[PDB]
Amino acid sequence: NRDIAQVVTENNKNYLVLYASQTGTAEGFAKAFSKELVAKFNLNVMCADVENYDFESLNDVPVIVSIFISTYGEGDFPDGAVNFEDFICNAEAGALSNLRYNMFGLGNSTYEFFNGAAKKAEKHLSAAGAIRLGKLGEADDGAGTTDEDYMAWKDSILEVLKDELHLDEQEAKFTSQFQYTVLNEITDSMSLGEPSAHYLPSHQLNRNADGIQLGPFDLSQPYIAPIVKSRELFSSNDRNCIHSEFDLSGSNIKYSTGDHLAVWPSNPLEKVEQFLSIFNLDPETIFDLKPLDPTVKVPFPTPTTIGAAIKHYLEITGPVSRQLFSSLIQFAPNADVKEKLTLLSKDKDQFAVEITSKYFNIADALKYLSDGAKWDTVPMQFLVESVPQMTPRYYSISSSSLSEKQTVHVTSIVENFPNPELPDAPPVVGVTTNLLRNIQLAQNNVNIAETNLPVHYDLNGPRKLFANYKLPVHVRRSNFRLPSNPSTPVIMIGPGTGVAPFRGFIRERVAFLESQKNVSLGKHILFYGSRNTDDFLYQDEWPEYAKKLDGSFEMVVAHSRLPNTKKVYVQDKLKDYEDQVFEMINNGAFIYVCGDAKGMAKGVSTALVGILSRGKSITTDEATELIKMLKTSGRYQEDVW
Ligand SMILES: Cc1cc2nc3c(=O)[nH]c(=O)nc-3n(C[C@H](O)[C@H](O)[C@H](O)COP(=O)(O)OP(=O)(O)OC[C@H]3O[C@@H](n4cnc5c(N)ncnc54)[C@H](O)[C@@H]3O)c2cc1C
Numbered sequence: 001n002r003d004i005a006q007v008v009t010e011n012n013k014n015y016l017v018l019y020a021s022q023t024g025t026a027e028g029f030a031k032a033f034s035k036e037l038v039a040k041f042n043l044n045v046m047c048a049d050v051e052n053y054d055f056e057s058l059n060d061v062p063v064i065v066s067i068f069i070s071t072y073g074e075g076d077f078p079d080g081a082v083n084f085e086d087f088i089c090n091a092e093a094g095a096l097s098n099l100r101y102n103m104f105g106l107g108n109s110t111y112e113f114f115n116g117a118a119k120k121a122e123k124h125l126s127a128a129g130a131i132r133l134g135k136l137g138e139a140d141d142g143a144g145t146t147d148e149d150y151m152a153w154k155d156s157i158l159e160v161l162k163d164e165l166h167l168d169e170q171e172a173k174f175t176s177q178f179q180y181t182v183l184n185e186i187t188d189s190m191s192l193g194e195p196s197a198h199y200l201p202s203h204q205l206n207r208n209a210d211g212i213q214l215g216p217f218d219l220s221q222p223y224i225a226p227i228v229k230s231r232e233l234f235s236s237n238d239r240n241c242i243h244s245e246f247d248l249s250g251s252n253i254k255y256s257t258g259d260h261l262a263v264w265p266s267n268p269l270e271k272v273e274q275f276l277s278i279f280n281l282d283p284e285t286i287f288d289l290k291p292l293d294p295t296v297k298v299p300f301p302t303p304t305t306i307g308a309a310i311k312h313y314l315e316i317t318g319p320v321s322r323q324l325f326s327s328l329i330q331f332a333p334n335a336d337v338k339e340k341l342t343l344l345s346k347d348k349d350q351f352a353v354e355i356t357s358k359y360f361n362i363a364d365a366l367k368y369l370s371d372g373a374k375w376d377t378v379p380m381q382f383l384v385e386s387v388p389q390m391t392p393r394y395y396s397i398s399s400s401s402l403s404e405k406q407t408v409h410v411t412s413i414v415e416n417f418p419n420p421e422l423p424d425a426p427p428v429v430g431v432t433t434n435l436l437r438n439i440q441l442a443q444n445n446v447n448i449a450e451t452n453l454p455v456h457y458d459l460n461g462p463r464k465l466f467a468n469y470k471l472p473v474h475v476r477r478s479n480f481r482l483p484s485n486p487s488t489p490v491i492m493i494g495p496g497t498g499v500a501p502f503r504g505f506i507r508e509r510v511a512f513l514e515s516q517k518n519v520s521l522g523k524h525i526l527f528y529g530s531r532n533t534d535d536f537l538y539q540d541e542w543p544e545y546a547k548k549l550d551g552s553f554e555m556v557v558a559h560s561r562l563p564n565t566k567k568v569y570v571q572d573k574l575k576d577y578e579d580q581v582f583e584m585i586n587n588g589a590f591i592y593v594c595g596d597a598k599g600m601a602k603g604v605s606t607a608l609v610g611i612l613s614r615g616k617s618i619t620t621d622e623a624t625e626l627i628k629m630l631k632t633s634g635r636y637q638e639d640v641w
């Protein structure tokens with residue numbers, strides 16, 4: 001049931017594919033690998049998420065095992081796989097003597113401890129007597145080769161397994177893991193986009209005395225919340241950054257300052273049409289899925305309608321995998337298209353040249369190859385099993401839980417830029433952020449027709465559940481936390497939207513200090529950065545905070561795109577203030593680093609190592625050593641995405 005060795009064996013599984021994924025990138029790969037393993041060798045594969053089983057009986061698995069693992073924080077596994085991680089990292093010598101395995105790890109050489117989770121896992125497994133088949137995969141998200149790195153690894157590993165298991169190959173064909181059935185009418189027990197089953201009429205939400213919706217909210221059960229206040233934070237005519245405030249009072253959701261909110265999106269309507277159209281699918285088509293065996297888990301709530309699945313369940317937007325092309329060879333519209341497809345599916349460069357570079361979505365790519373010709377010979381089941389599941393997007397809460405107990409503010413820079421290849425094509429946009437903007441404009445009664453909103457969304461949702469600008473959401477507890485003692489000095493470094501956590505930190509300290517109106521607040525310094533003065537987040541708030549925190553606060557701003565001047569980064573300002581900074585560090589100061597800006601984590605860490613190197617007059621190595629210590633002792637925290 002939860003005993004891995006037992007489940008494999010009880011379902012006569014030939015192969016075991018395991019995956020530890022947060023954002024669901026490994027999940028998707030693991031699944032692709034399984035489908036190909038079944039298409040080519042007919043093997044009865046089990047594709048399990050390492051968080052739904054108890055690997056104590058791992059050494060009793062009579063089948064070869066593939067492990068897809070991602071990396072987060074210090075080279076470590078993704079929360080929600082901590083169990084799996086512990087089993088593996090606390091495995092004694094000769095504890096996995098029977099385990100034959102191969103693994104593909106996902107990473108980003110932009111971080112330190114690049115793919116350190118897969119690396120760590122591999123180090124323990126071998127040591128626990130487990131033999132590794134084929135090369136250790138290593139996807140580099142930083143270099144944007146993740147998908148190709150897989151393709152490469154995948155092919156080699158398949159030759160490794162063809163041998164080890166003496167498998168006879170066969171032209172690869174699709175084999176649904178479900179029993180696709182087409183219903184005739186919609187019920188209160190059938191979904192139309194509802195986040196989870198609990199929100200279907202036939203089910204009852206679990207409230208309490210005063211109706212407060214209860215239950216634990218997470219990836220399996222969100223909490224539809226109403227954005228009670230929105231506003232634009234920028235003032236540029238190109239970029240946009242929305243500030244959204246969610247009212248969580250209607251539930252029993254508590255959150256700590258420095259946590260994360262996960263927003264569950266819905267595809268933009270213009271993109272939903274495109275998908276439906278190129279495949280010639282009927283939105284209304286009611287269908288249902290029946291797992292063809294115990295280990296198969298239905299992807300979303302069913303029954304449901306095809307349009308409800310393409311608008312709420314599948315990630316119909318994003319980079320097209322070459323492997324997806326290779327999988328569509330079967331269902332190619334005509335012979336000429338079936339041809340172009342076969343070539344692109346094998347030539348890495350051609351695929352990048354004809355597809356990747358143009359920023360195509362699946363719909364677009366397919367339309368491109370077919371010149372409009374519809375792929376009406378593709379089964380919804382294929383799509384359900386071939387298009388990545390939609391996933392929630394995380395945000396760093398910018399509100400303090402001390403002064404906003406049940407209100408969560410979210411600072412979200414909008415992802416919407418012009419296609420660099422096709423000047424005439426629609427901008428490359430991001431689902432969730434442009435969604436939040438739509439709600440920001442709508443809610444604020446702005447003639448959207450005027451604005452530069454690239455797309456729009458169903459703002460009523462499933463059975464008007466999202467009625468009144470509400471979205472599925474849930475809090476993800478983190479370890480980004482202000483020092484226990486208020487007296488402790490604090491150093492916060494966050495460029496762009498990376499200030500979101502610190503807004504809260506500051507609001508938290510400002511709130512606390514007024515809860516005394518005694519306590520002297522240790523020094524707090526925030527190093528902010530942004531292009532110009534149009535993208536200066538909460539510019540008007542900071543001065544107001546400084547009044548209340550007096551000489552306990554200090555903000556240091558760097559701009560990188562001011563006309564007629566040198567480009568300035570926070571790590572530049574750190575060295576300018578290397579004495580104030582070095583002193584604080586010698587005072588038990590805590591160092592917080594948050595933001596995106598690829599290479600900003602390493603850069604900032606490297607500036608600190610230098611501030612330390614110079615300060616204590618030590619080598620650059622000793623200094624990086626001291627910095628690794630701060631990161632282990634929790635004095636140096638990071639929230640870099
Ligand atoms: C722990 C954590 C904390 C975070 N905190 C914050 C925060 O405080 N603030 C914040 O703004 N973000 C934060 N993020 C980032 C955020 O979760 C999302 O990455 C961001 O909002 C983008 O969302 P989206 O819906 O636009 O993305 P998606 O729709 O998934 O798009 C991603 C990008 O791909 C582009 N794209 C679209 N189609 C294609 C295509 N066919 N080919 C290639 N590219 C394409 C989009 O235009 C976009 O730029 C955080 C992430 C994590 C993991």
Ligand SMILES: Cc1cc2nc3c(=O)[nH]c(=O)nc-3n(C[C@H](O)[C@H](O)[C@H](O)COP(=O)(O)O)c2cc1C
Pocket residue numbers: 020021022023024025026027070071072073074075078106107108109111112113114115116141146639640641
């Ligand atoms: C918050 C965050 C932290 C990360 N930390 C690391 C890291 O320390 N090392 C690394 O190689 N990659 C790191 N990555 C990148 C992931 O390993 C990479 O994006 C991978 O594709 C994620 O796959 P998943 O969606 O299956 O989790 C990080 C990504 C995020 C969002």
